[PDB]
Design a protein around this ligand. Sequence first.
Ligand code: CLA
Ligand code: CLA
Ligand code: CLA
Ligand code: CLA
Ligand SMILES: CCCCCCCCCCCCCCCC(=O)OC[C@H](COP(=O)(O)OC[C@@H](O)CO)OC(=O)CCCCCCCCCCCCCCC
Ligand SMILES: CC1=C(/C=C/C(C)=C/C=C/C(C)=C/C=C/C=C(C)/C=C/C=C(C)/C=C/C2=C(C)C[C@H](O)CC2(C)C)C(C)(C)C[C@H](O)C1
Ligand SMILES: CC1=C[C@H](O)CC(C)(C)[C@H]1/C=C/C(C)=C/C=C/C(C)=C/C=C/C=C(C)/C=C/C=C(C)/C=C/C1=C(C)C[C@H](O)CC1(C)C
Lengths: 86, 221, 41, 241, 741
Amino acid sequence: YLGSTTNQIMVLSTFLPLVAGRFGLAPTSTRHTNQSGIKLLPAEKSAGLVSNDPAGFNAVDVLALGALGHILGCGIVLGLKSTGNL
Amino acid sequence: VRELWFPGNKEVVPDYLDGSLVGDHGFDPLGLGSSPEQLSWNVHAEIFHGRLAMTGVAGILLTSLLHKGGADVPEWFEAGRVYLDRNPNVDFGALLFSTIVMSGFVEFKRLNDIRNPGSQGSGILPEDFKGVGGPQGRTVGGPYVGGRYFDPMGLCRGSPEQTLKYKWNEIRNGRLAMMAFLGFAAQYAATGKGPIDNLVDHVADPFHTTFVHNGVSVPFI
Amino acid sequence: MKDFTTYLSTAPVLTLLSVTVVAGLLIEINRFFPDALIAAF
Amino acid sequence: EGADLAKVERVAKVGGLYKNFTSGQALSYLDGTLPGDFGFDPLGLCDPEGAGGFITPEWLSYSEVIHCRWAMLGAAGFLAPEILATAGLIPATPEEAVWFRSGVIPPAGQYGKYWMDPYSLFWIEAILMNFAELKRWQDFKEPGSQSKQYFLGLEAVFGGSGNPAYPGGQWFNMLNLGKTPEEMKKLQTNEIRNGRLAMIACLGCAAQGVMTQKGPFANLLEHLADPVSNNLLGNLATILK
Amino acid sequence: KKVKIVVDRNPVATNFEKWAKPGHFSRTLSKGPTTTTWIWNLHADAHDFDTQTSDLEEISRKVFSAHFGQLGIIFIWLSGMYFHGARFSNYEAWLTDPTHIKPSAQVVWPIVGQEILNADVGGGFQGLQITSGFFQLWRAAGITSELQLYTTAIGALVMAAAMFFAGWFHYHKAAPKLEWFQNVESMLNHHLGGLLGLGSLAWAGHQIHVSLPINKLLDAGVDPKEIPLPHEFTLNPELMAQLYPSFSKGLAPFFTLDWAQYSDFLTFQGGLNPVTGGLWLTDTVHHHLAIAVLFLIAGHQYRTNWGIGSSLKEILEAHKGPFTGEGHKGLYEILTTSWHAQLAINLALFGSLSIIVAHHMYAMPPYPYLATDYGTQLSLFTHHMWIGGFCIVGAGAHAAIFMVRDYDPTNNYNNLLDRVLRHRDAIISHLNWVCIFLGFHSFGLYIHNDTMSALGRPQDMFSDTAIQLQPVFAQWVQNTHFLAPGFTAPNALASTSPSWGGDVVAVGGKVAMMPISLGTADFLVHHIHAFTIHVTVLILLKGVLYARSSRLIPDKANLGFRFPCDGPGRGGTCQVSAWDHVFLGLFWMYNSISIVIFHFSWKMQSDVWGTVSANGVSHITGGNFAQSANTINGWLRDFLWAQSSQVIQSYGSALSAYGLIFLGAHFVWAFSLMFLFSGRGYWQELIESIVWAHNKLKVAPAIQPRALSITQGRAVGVAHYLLGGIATTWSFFLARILAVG
Ligand code: CLA
Ligand code: CLA
Ligand code: CLA
Ligand code: CLA
Ligand SMILES: CCCCCCCCCCCCCCCC(=O)OC[C@H](COP(=O)(O)OC[C@@H](O)CO)OC(=O)CCCCCCCCCCCCCCC
Ligand SMILES: CC1=C(/C=C/C(C)=C/C=C/C(C)=C/C=C/C=C(C)/C=C/C=C(C)/C=C/C2=C(C)C[C@H](O)CC2(C)C)C(C)(C)C[C@H](O)C1
Ligand SMILES: CC1=C[C@H](O)CC(C)(C)[C@H]1/C=C/C(C)=C/C=C/C(C)=C/C=C/C=C(C)/C=C/C=C(C)/C=C/C1=C(C)C[C@H](O)CC1(C)C
């Protein structure tokens, strides 16, 4: 199973939002979106979370974005599986 | 102060159970004797229960020891029916009525002792049935009735220390006898033999003859 | 205790207790002496 | 919030993957006292404001120490029967000296050769542990008692100390180890680190027992045999077989 | 800031002193009962925690502990149910032959000839015939033993003790602070994820490991005493593998995302199991797994102690548009400070949920051998309908109470509540017009049918034989649902219910579910339902809106939520409060729900329930709903005179009790009229004469007999009316369905 296309796509769909969230491409625990939902606000430190990362990707950022990555990846893998692909 | 039913935990019931009563270790977790009048009633009840259970357990033990030497004595749990069979001319109702009438005379005597502590050592009775008092600071009446008739051999007249020691012996043996009779009833329900029978069954083989192996305690085994 | 017995003397509890006692008594009487239509003495 | 920097400087001084999991709320009340205080508290359970019931900084620390001691006992007792059977020193096949096949769970196995059946052993356990634990609890509530009432002369060693988790009287600290309060703190941190490791080990042993149906030492040996195939992922097909 | 646990230690001392003195909570109730009105107000204000304390902290703590007490009562009730199933029930006998043994779980004593009530249900047993659907529930769980019911009953008793201990502990030993209760985001996170989510997931686990192999073997047909016990199925995948082969691969497909391999027990089929007449337990397994995952996802929305998450306040404040001014500004503050607002919302949603449950359980029976149990069908539907109606009226009442007590105009300026309160006359005017129009075009249609039938002009009345009124939209929706599997539901093998259309699902010679046709009579009854619902919502809405003020009585909120009147001035102001609006809404809800259950009973006995005779379905009443329900005389004759034959002729049978209550309830209802047509003054002067009679013999009480207050007279009247009506309908339904069916 390791290295197969369902593994490539799962690891890709879990890893990509982790990159997106660090470099300000995705909303995390510091940088939220305004009421329009489309523009991202600057980082606030009101959450009270500290980390050893330079940017400040906290453990909760990792949990949230990896969880969403698994949701998206499960959806994508099962959608490709359930349409004759994969 | 004194020894408690629970070392530490001085949150023993408020000082209506101070170290004054005989047998007092602060055991009233459910507050059944908080008010003084109810506490006096409970002291009477405990002493009477201890004495009656001491009598009953001694009778049960001796009758179960005789029933092991083959003597024509039934076990304690079948003595009533055995006697009624072996004496067919007696009527259950008659025996039950007589027991309630003769017990009633003395129990009305004790009742009117509790109502008025000194009132029963006069009239037909002499004056020794007036009672020596005891708990709650009363100097007359009570569960402890001295005189030459309930204390004929004078084992609490003279030497207050000796009186206290014997009072403690009575109370502790009474509590033990009450627990023992509860054990008798429970063992008879769970096994169906006599008390001495159960004891010798256990000592003969200490294992495989516990409460687990009777099939009623641990219900599934 | 004194307050517990005072609670047991309240109308809501004592009434319910007395109704239960009288009901139980009538139920026992009808269980032992059933179907009694007249005062046959 | 932005931390306090000076407060979380001490957590960075303990080193390791700590600091990565500590928060500003935790450092408001975790200042270094209590051994094993590395600031890990993501949920603020030891917060002294609004404490009560069993959620208090004292009860929580006491329970952690009690658990670490029970878990060290349990981990040593999980490993010892199996390693002694595998070494052949004791007479039990290594698939019978496994910890969960000892009669604790009758459906999972039994060792019907005890000098009493398990239920009666549990009865005597209940009585004796009721004595021990009830005395421990009433010493926790009343921090000086249990040494006043008679107990066949045992009451001499039941005075305790300040911290209920460390009574260290005449018996609980027979060898009188750690005569320096600094050395006492160092040994306390030894005890707590070993105890937390043993908590993790005991949970792991239970999970492996469900997951592989073999002994913890047998699981370790079969993992060292072929690591790639004998692991958590490899065993995912055959789990209760 | 930062959600956390806060408690006060030992706020209250556990004594018995206050039980000795009734009325301790309320200052007005204190100082003795000078009159019997004290006795009544002692109970009327027992749980009104608002009037016992103004501190929201204390109110909240009392609510928390009262909830624990309610949970303890429910656990006592469940323990009783399971214990009666274990001891005084024919459950083990009913498992073997579920089609001919009548479920029972309550035996009576011999004491006064009441032994006759012990029905010859079956299984060599005698007892009352239960209709609570517990046997079907237990079989669906996968019990198949009377030891397991005993274990469950004892566990429920232990849990009841735990609930009562928890309530005592959290009121007297560690009581939460107010800022704990106001953490609505954390409570929502835990009730979406932890409660409903993990609960659904755990139930799916149980069904997969217990309810599915056991019920598979029972449905294959096996004496239950030979089936392996549930732990045997659970602990070795060998047995499950022989039953469900995908268990031979274990959890590897799950963590590899090859979930299709679980298709043998995670099915998407719909319809009913042909052997049991219930939904496929594989379908319900898949359902519970899916919604458990969905609720775990739902429970991560709101923000707590970490940056991620949304804020309820921020979400609410951001939904404002041109037509609403400030929109939801201030809704958050009036929801996390007033308990009655939450009570109104939760009661409304809970009653609607109960009604939805009733609907979805008659149409698509979820338990094995429950569709064929016609008594269980009818009883469960009617019970949940009545529970839903009561909860809805309670929602109206507590909306009124919040509008009277917990509403301040300072924070509700030009927001949604202010906008609604600022145009209530338009809402009420238009709703009253709708009620008029629906009442006319629903009841006048029935009266036109009656008049034309009595005149001998059936070609004029509205019926299938003449002027048709056909539910085109409902029929179109039925057809669309029928055509779904394979079209708009490609992976569904069959329709969700045999009521859309298709074939007749019959089990054991009895119909489980067959297509339901909608015609002119169905049109008429649906519009009757709309009319009654609209009048009820009009009454409750008008009460809520005019709770505070009215052009007639502007200072109404100064008189309180519950006051009788405001004198005979202004022409008479009887029943002007919000409480009296709830009082009338109770009557209208009774009328509504009663018509709903009559419609269900007649339609099911006339077009669904029956027996299959190898050539067609022979329904209980024979199909007379389609032609006779068009007229009022049809309901009085072909449903109410005709179907009452089983209740009035029940003397000397096991249903004789239903013959008594049917009569007895007729008493209570009529008795209620005493309280609803009379007024307090007559009774006060009558009691004055009675008290003179007592005085003449020195037996007057020192506590004054006082006639009931006006509010209490109305409350007693409505309570008796509802009790009598509901008991009559309950006994009639039960006797009818337990003598036929
Ligand atoms: C049902 C609602 C409910 C709610 C909302 C609360 C809420 C609270 N309780 Mg409480 N409690 C409840 C029920 C509830 N309790 C019941 C029914 C009991 C009787 C058993 C208790 C007995 C109790 C005590 C003795 C104490 C509290 C305390 C507290 C407070 C601390 C919260 C905490 O840290 O818990 C944390 C929970 C844990 C650390 C471990 C939870 C493990 C338990 C056994 C639950 C697991 C069972 C699970 C739900 C079912 C899974 C089955 C399993 C086999 C897989 C908190 C405000 C503490 C307090 O005083 O406040 C400061 C306190 O000491 N509660
Ligand atoms: C490696 C685990 C470990 C460690 C480092 C400690 C460390 C400590 N314990 Mg602790 N304890 C442990 C396990 C441990 N304990 C377990 C499992 C239990 C449950 C039985 C206890 C129960 C316990 C109590 C009740 C108390 C302590 C106390 C103490 C402190 C006293 C100093 C000391 O003697 O150190 C311990 C030195 C070592 C652990 C190194 C020795 C390692 C070997 C393997 C020990 C084997 C035991 C030995 C072979 C048995 C015979 C020896 C003896 C009878 C002659 C100290 C910080 C006392 C205290 O806090 O004083 C105030 C205190 O009251 N312990
Ligand atoms: C996983 C977390 C969790 C769970 C499972 C629950 C579950 C429940 N809560 Mg609770 N709550 C939680 C978190 C949780 N809550 C948190 C974090 C808060 C703080 C805001 C609250 C605050 C809160 C309030 C104010 C109230 C509840 C209430 C309830 C009960 C709802 C009534 C009912 O009949 O439902 C269904 C019934 C059941 C599912 C039966 C299950 C019963 C078990 C024993 C639940 C016990 C689990 C307990 C919550 C975990 C800790 C206990 C431990 C410390 C001993 C329900 C049992 C209401 C209540 O009934 O009061 C008691 C109520 O008033 N909760
Ligand atoms: C979760 C549900 C719920 C909760 C918690 C509450 C809570 C509350 N309600 Mg309420 N209510 C509800 C649902 C609820 N209600 C529903 C569904 C309705 C519609 C009927 C109402 C209608 C309502 C009104 C009209 C009023 C309240 C009032 C109150 C408050 C005082 C209640 C009280 O102590 O009266 C005392 C309790 C009693 C008098 C018990 C008797 C109740 C009836 C007569 C019992 C019926 C008999 C029973 C079914 C058994 C019959 C068999 C018989 C032969 C023995 C209180 C905070 C009062 C208030 O002022 O609010 C502040 C108020 O006047 N409620
Ligand atoms: C059950 C569901 C999940 C539970 C989650 C919640 C539990 C919270 C536990 C958090 C721990 C507390 C803080 C830890 C913080 C912490 O780690 O402390 C640091 C730890 C020990 O530190 P010390 O106490 O020795 O500190 C002194 C030194 O660190 C000085 O620098 O050092 C380590 O790095 C050991 C951990 C390595 C972990 C080895 C595990 C290897 C598994 C790898 C798996 C990856 C592949 C998987 C493929 C499937
Ligand atoms: C309140 C209380 C108690 C009791 C107080 C009382 C109630 C005192 C007064 C008691 C009285 C007046 C008792 C009267 C008892 C009459 C009895 C027991 C009659 C018994 C006969 C029976 C049951 C039948 C015998 C047949 C037999 C078997 C043979 C046939 O031919 C038929 C038949 C006649 C039916 C006790 C327990 C004693 C102690 C005290 O601490 C608490
Ligand atoms: C820190 C924190 C904080 C934050 O904030 C939050 C959170 C996250 C919650 C956290 C965390 C937590 C955790 C991790 C927990 C875990 C624990 C454990 C695991 C324990 C165990 C623990 C463990 C334990 C006790 C164990 C013990 C054991 C034992 C006794 C055993 C015994 C035995 C033996 C010897 C052998 C035999 O044959 C059997 C028996 C008899 C059986």
